[PDB]
RNA sequence: UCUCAGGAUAGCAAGAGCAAGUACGCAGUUUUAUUAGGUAAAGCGAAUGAUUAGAGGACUCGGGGUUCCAAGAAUCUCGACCUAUUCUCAAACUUUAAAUUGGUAAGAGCCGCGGAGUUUACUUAAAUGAACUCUCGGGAAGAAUGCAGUGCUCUUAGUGGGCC
RNA sequence: CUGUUAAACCAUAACGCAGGCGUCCUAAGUGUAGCUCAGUGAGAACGGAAAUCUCACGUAGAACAAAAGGGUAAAAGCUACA
RNA sequence: GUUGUCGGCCAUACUAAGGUGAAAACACCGGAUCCCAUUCGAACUCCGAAGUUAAGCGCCUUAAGGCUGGGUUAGUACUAAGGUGGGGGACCGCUUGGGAAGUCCCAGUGUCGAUAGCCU
């Protein structure tokens, strides 16, 4: 076996998603709760059905999720997974070689507390992508990444041990 | 997992066009191009493919036949080497200079270089021949812009000014030239700025990047730089604009094919063994035996 | 009332009783579904046109121009 | 029927070809036409522009006027025991060239040929085209295959 | 069509005429050339809709009963998911797809990117194209068979409950 | 007005089948650009059958005011603007 | 022999898991001051040149799925004309004409271009 250094395993992207379940101030408050994390404008997803359980009427503001690449989002990967021991479960794993934990008291993050600001719960999902991710997210000439290109599970769980020091269980 | 892929599926599968699987021709927008008004009967129908290349910027002149699709004249970016540039030839000048060159030559197959000029000063202002048309009126070209987007200060349109600053007509507006501006908050002005296209046609911002390149660290200009300033030093001169005055009186005064005069003889062992002819029904029947006893064996 | 709705029984043949009437192939035909853009340069080309013989106070007229 | 309307009944006839959904079909759009061509009329479904009433399909008329988007052309119908002249005007998409003529100038130029080049030797040749004959005298020295009428027998 | 026992209106019918009865014309016929079509059938281990049979299944989605000991594991029972199949079907299903049948044609008003013309918002960068004129070159007559029903005007009767 | 009866051009009856029309829309008309929907597998605090976020796969199985049939994938679908 | 660019036909081109990769191109690739662009320089846009065939892509491999063409099916089903044919009938069959489709077989698996090139 011979082996490029295009093999390279990245983070693609971290996203930060925060769903309340509400259309009110709380939102505004994860929204800023947001900007303040990332440094970028954070984005709102909409409630795409009714549900009464959930008082949830369809196109109704939902969510607010954010989108982060390079150092920022591997700077708060440290703050996340140090917030989570640096400790994650198998089933935290995915087929598309890409992982995800939770987390609540964004407090534990290293941001201040206010009356606007109070704790909030958050979805951390990491996608992890070798070097020619392009040639699937271009427009001219699109096409799917080969086989030998992709990132199997195994080899994610290996990229979390051998990064960031964790165990897996 | 129920398989979502059947024998069905297959047989069901429109097979999309050669050509739309491969992610190069938008079929919507060329028949849109193509359509010529069939009151002329057989009447040929002019346009202008602008294809960037991560290297080369490709100009042609194309028209639609039936069986296929003609080139009346070609500009491939790397005929700027035969004058002298090594790196960039992906710039926005590269592709001036490239649709300078196909004009010029187009004009020159045709004749009409001596009726048609063009603005040989470049200023940015709206050029295209069409309105000092008086004999044989200019040649017209359609801009294809493909797959590419219409982003303001596009290559495309750079090889648009090469060419209808080298005289053929190209209907333009000039709203996505480089250097256009339409003011959102009060509703304040259309603010065409010739001096920012062509200061982009030369490539004064390439050298506005060097110094700042320059300014921050050596290692920066290196990274970024390196063919393309030991390029610059082998033509002994100190800016782009030079550079590119000279590409582009060089190509306004002997613009012609570079015709190689190379003559090859028979060099073809090694790749026709890489490129394996397809395998004879016996040879598979011999492949099934051969595997068959493999596996009997063990 | 009764009544029987619709029979085309004796139609068919009442129809190729006399034959199947065909219209006559005329050299020269009419102008309808022709364009204007066309039908002005036939008029201007025949016009103009020395071969084709025309009236005489018409000639005068070509001939003047 | 109690219903006429345009398209009425049109549902196998109009349903484009099998896998023929959203063919563009450039070649139709490049197609040259000229007043005295003979055309064939075909429809295509996705074009709604154009479209001839459903009785003109596959019908062949000869072209009358060329406009920008559409061929004018002449078929006739028969009404009532008489036949009436029809001025269809139809988008380039349901037109295409009907062979029927091709086929003629081709023959033609290579009989002239022939009967020139005799003209030249002084035999007459005649391009009239015979039909099937009655078959020559023959022959035959073969192998005889000897059958014989099967018993009955019953496959279940 | 207040129209349903009626009226007009075409069609069918008679008489008087017109025209060179383009026979290279005509045809409820074939032949030949170019072409249409989704019916019959067939097909549902192919789409849509139905719809029986048994088995397997590393990997499965849940239920129940079994058992043990214990809450888990082992295991019987169900279906759902594939696995390889299988029974019988559709006028408002269909990939496939007939017979019978529909267009258009089978030359002097022919063929040939050969000529010379004509075109004042027709076409093209383009004597480019296009349409028509006068030219140049070639062209045994360009399938069988039949023609004691050639085409067209004019005026007008009866009919408009049908039946086998 | 659509699909059938209707018998592969067209045409074809019945108080024959199954349905639909006397409205609705300054956008649901028109244009440009970008995007790809239905659904499936695996993955992420509260989160639970079902809310959002991810990736892989998705011939079209979704959507297109209204009935049916046909038509549509860098669109006729979704988003934004004019 | 091989490449980019624009293609006509639109699976013999698609789908799956692999082998292979001269040259030149194409790409992956490096970077966000500038025109342009987003929640995010992912993309779109711009500027490049430290790496690399690992991707994309060419070419081939599979008693591969699919698709394409022939064979069987079968002169079977259906059908044109005739019948003072048979049968109580449903229906079947005689004379003269046309004539299919799935299981199962066997073969094939992209073709035609204009333009500029690589293989001295
Ligand atoms: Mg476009
Ligand atoms: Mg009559
Ligand atoms: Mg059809
Ligand atoms: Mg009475
Ligand atoms: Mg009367
Ligand atoms: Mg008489
Ligand atoms: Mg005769
Ligand atoms: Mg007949
Ligand atoms: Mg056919
Ligand atoms: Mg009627
Ligand atoms: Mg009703
Ligand atoms: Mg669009
Ligand atoms: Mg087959
Ligand atoms: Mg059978």
Redesign the pocket.
Same mark, same amino acid.
């Given at each position: 076996k011979?082996?490029?250094?295009?093999?390279?395993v990245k983070i693609?992207?971290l996203?930060?998603?925060?769903?309340?379940?509400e259309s009110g101030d709380k939102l505004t408050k994860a929204a800023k709760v947001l900007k303040d994390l990332?440094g970028?404008?954070?984005?709102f997803?909409?409630?795409?059905?009714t549900?009464?359980?959930?008082?949830?009427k369809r196109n109704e503001k939902?969510?607010?999720?954010?989108?982060?690449?390079?150092d920022?989002?591997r700077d708060i990967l440290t703050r996340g997974l140090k917030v989570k021991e640096m400790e994650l479960?198998?089933?935290?794993?995915?087929?598309?070689?890409?992982?995800?934990?939770?987390?609540?008291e964004h407090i534990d993050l290293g941001m201040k507390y206010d009356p606007s600001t109070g704790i909030?719960?958050?979805?951390?999902?990491v996608?992890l992508?070798?070097?020619?991710?392009?040639?699937?997210?271009?427009?001219?000439?699109?096409?799917?990444?080969?086989?030998?290109?992709?990132i199997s599970?195994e080899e994610c769980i290996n990229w979390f041990k051998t990064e960031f020091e964790g165990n897996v269980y | 997992?129920?398989?979502?892929?059947?024998?069905?599926?297959?047989?069901?599968?429109?097979?999309?066009?050669?050509?739309?699987?491969?992610?190069?021709?938008?079929?919507?927008?060329?028949k849109?191009?193509?359509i010529?008004?069939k009151?002329?009967?057989?009447?040929?129908?002019?346009?202008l493919?602008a294809?960037?290349?991560?290297?080369?910027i490709?100009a042609?002149i194309?028209?639609?036949?039936?069986?296929?699709?003609?080139?009346?004249?070609?500009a491939?970016?790397?005929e700027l080497k035969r004058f002298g540039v090594s790196?960039?030839?992906?710039?926005?000048?590269?592709?001036y200079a490239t649709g300078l060159l196909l004009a010029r030559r187009l004009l020159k197959?045709?004749?009409?270089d001596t009726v048609y000029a063009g603005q040989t000063k470049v200023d940015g202002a709206y050029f295209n021949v069409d309105e000092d048309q008086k004999?044989?009126?200019?040649?017209?070209?359609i801009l294809?812009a493909?797959?590419?987007?219409?982003?303001?200060?596009?290559?495309?349109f750079?090889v648009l000014k090469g060419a209808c600053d080298g005289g053929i007509?190209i209907p333009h507006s000039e709203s996505r030239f480089?250097?256009?501006?339409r003011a959102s908050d009060e509703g304040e002005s259309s603010k065409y700025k010739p001096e920012?296209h062509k200061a982009?046609i030369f490539?004064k911002?390439?050298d506005?990047?060097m110094k700042?390149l320059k300014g921050q660290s050596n290692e920066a200009f290196?990274?970024?730089?390196?063919?393309?300033?030991?390029?610059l030093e082998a033509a002994k001169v100190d800016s782009?604009e030079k550079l590119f005055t000279k590409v582009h009186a060089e190509i306004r005064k002997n613009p012609e094919?570079?015709?190689?005069t190379?003559?090859?003889?028979?060099?073809?062992?090694?790749?026709?063994?890489?490129?394996?002819?397809?395998?004879?029904?016996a040879?598979?029947?011999d492949?099934?035996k051969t595997?068959?006893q493999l596996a009997l064996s063990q | 009332?009764?009544?029987?709705?619709?029979?085309?029984?004796?139609?068919?043949?009442?129809?190729?009783?006399?034959?199947?009437?065909?219209?006559?192939?005329?050299?020269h035909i009419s102008t309808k579904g022709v364009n204007?853009?066309?039908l002005?340069?036939?008029?201007?080309?025949?016009?103009?046109?020395?071969?084709?013989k025309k009236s005489k106070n018409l000639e005068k007229k070509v001939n003047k121009? | 029927?109690?219903?006429?309307?345009?398209?009425?009944?049109?549902?196998?006839?109009?349903?484009?070809?099998?896998?023929?959904?959203?063919?563009?079909?450039?070649?139709?759009?490049?197609t040259?036409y000229?007043?005295?061509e003979?055309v064939?009329i075909?429809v295509?479904?996705? +074009?709604?522009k154009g479209m001839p009433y #459903?009785?003109?399909?596959?019908?062949?008329? $000869?072209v009358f006027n060329?406009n920008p988007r559409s061929i004018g052309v002449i078929?006739?119908?028969?009404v009532?025991?008489?036949?009436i002249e029809k001025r269809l005007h139809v988008k380039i998409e349901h037109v295409r060239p009907?062979?029927?003529?091709?086929?003629?100038?081709k023959?033609?130029?290579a009989?002239? +040929?022939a009967?020139?080049?005799?003209? #030249?030797a002084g035999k007459?040749?005649?391009? $009239?085209?015979?039909?099937?004959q009655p078959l020559e005298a023959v022959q035959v020295q073969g192998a005889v295959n000897f059958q014989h009428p099967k018993v009955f027998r019953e496959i279940f």
């Open positions: 011979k082996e490029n250094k295009m093999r390279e693609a992207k996203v930060i998603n925060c769903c309340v379940g990332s970028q404008e954070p984005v997803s909409r409630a795409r059905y549900i009464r359980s959930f008082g949830i939902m969510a607010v999720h954010v989108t982060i690449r390079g920022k989002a479960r198998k089933k935290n794993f995915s087929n598309t070689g890409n992982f995800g934990f939770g987390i609540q909030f719960g958050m979805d951390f999902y996608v992508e070798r070097p020619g991710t392009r040639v699937a997210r271009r427009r001219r000439a699109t096409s799917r990444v080969g086989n030998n290109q992709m599970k | 997992v129920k398989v979502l892929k059947t024998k069905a599926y297959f047989k069901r599968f429109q097979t999309k066009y050669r050509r739309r699987r491969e992610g190069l021709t938008d079929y919507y927008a060329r849109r191009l193509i010529q008004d009151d002329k009967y057989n009447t040929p129908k002019y346009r493919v294809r960037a290349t991560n290297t080369r490709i042609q194309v028209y639609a036949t039936l069986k296929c699709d003609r080139v009346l004249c070609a491939d970016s790397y790196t960039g030839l992906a710039s926005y000048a590269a592709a197959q045709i004749g009409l004999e044989k009126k200019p040649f017209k070209a294809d493909g797959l590419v987007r219409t982003t303001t200060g596009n290559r495309v750079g007509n480089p250097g256009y501006v920012d982009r490539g911002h390439i506005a990047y700042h290196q990274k970024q730089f390196s063919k393309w300033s030991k390029t782009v094919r570079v015709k190689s190379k003559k090859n003889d028979k060099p073809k062992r090694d790749h026709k063994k890489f490129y394996p002819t397809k395998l004879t029904a040879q598979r029947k492949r099934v595997k068959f | 009332a009764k009544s029987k709705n619709s029979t085309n029984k004796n139609q068919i043949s009442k129809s190729h009783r006399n034959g199947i009437k065909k219209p006559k192939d005329h050299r204007p853009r066309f002005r340069n036939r008029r201007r080309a025949i016009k103009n046109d020395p071969s084709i121009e | 029927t109690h219903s006429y309307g345009y398209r009425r009944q049109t549902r196998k006839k109009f349903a484009k070809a099998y896998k023929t959904k959203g063919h563009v079909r450039i070649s139709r759009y490049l040259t000229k007043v005295g003979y064939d075909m295509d479904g996705s +074009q709604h #459903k009785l003109y399909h596959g019908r062949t008329g $000869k060329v078929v006739h119908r028969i009532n025991g008489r036949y009907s062979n029927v003529k091709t086929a003629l100038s023959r033609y130029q009989n002239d +040929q009967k020139a080049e005799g003209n #030249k007459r040749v005649s391009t $009239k085209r015979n039909p099937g």
